[PDB]
Ligand binder design. Structure first.
Ligand SMILES: *[C@@H]1O[C@H](CO)[C@@H](O)[C@H](O)[C@H]1NC(C)=O
Length: 234
């Protein structure tokens, strides 16, 4: 995240970090939905995913920090692109649940749709400057802007994409490499999943793309309930 500062240690209990059994590098983030489910971006998937919960600094572990592996991973199977990037979302079921604590808590799904003008907060362990990754997650506030700003830049995100375009038109604040899969928080609810932006991040007139969670609420709840034939919103 560029244009922000280290997050308050207690403000991101739902934030999880994703890495692999082969690399300790945080390639993406995710959000805890309940005691055994994490919501993230589909492109964040990897063969041997490892999830860190309750973490702030990568070098000073919180008392309640936990590590988990998936017992199940679920995707949208009715996508426009074969690589599935038009519906960049995935559910990960933890092999073993976690218990809530100061640094581990669930984030609520959106109770209603929110759009242009909404002030939201982004967070992650992604780049904070040219080739610079922090040891602690960074946070900053951005705005959901007219979806038209994104459509041209990412011609694979059409006008009807179930996505939110967000950032600061003047530039300076944006999600970056390593932040994908993280939550976009608006009014205390997770309204988006970081999907991707332009490189370098934070450029003038180049907001980023966030998967619009609200549209996937029913799919998410059905999957968590155990349904395995439910499809993602068309
Ligand atoms: C799964 O969800 C679909 C869509 O809501 C529904 O039609 C179907 O009956 C459900 N199946 C189960 C396991 O109840």
């Amino acid at each position: 995240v560029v244009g922000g500062d280290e997050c308050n240690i207690n403000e991101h209990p739902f934030l999880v970090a994703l890495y692999t059994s082969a690399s300790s590098t945080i390639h993406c983030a995710g959000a805890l939905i309940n005691r055994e489910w994490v919501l993230t971006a589909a492109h964040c998937d990897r063969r041997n995913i490892r999830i860190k919960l309750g973490m702030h600094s990568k070098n000073i572990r919180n008392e309640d920090e936990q590590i988990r592996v998936p017992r199940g991973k679920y995707f949208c199977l009715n996508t426009k692109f074969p690589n599935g990037l038009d519906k960049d979302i995935m559910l990960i079921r933890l092999r073993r649940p976690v218990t809530y604590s100061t640094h581990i808590a669930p984030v609520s799904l959106p109770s209603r749709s929110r759009g242009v003008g909404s002030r939201c907060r982004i967070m992650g362990w992604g780049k904070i400057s040219t080739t610079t990754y922090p040891d602690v997650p960074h946070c900053t506030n951005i705005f959901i802007v007219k979806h038209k700003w994104c459509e041209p830049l990412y011609p694979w995100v059409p006008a009807d994409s179930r996505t939110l375009c967000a950032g600061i038109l003047k530039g300076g604040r944006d999600t970056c490499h390593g932040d994908s899969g993280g939550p976009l928080i608006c009014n205390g609810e997770m309204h988006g999943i970081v999907a991707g932006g332009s490189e370098p991040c934070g450029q003038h007139l180049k907001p980023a793309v966030y998967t619009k969670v609200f549209d996937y609420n029913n799919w998410i709840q059905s999957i968590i309930a155990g349904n395995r034939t439910v499809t993602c919103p068309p």
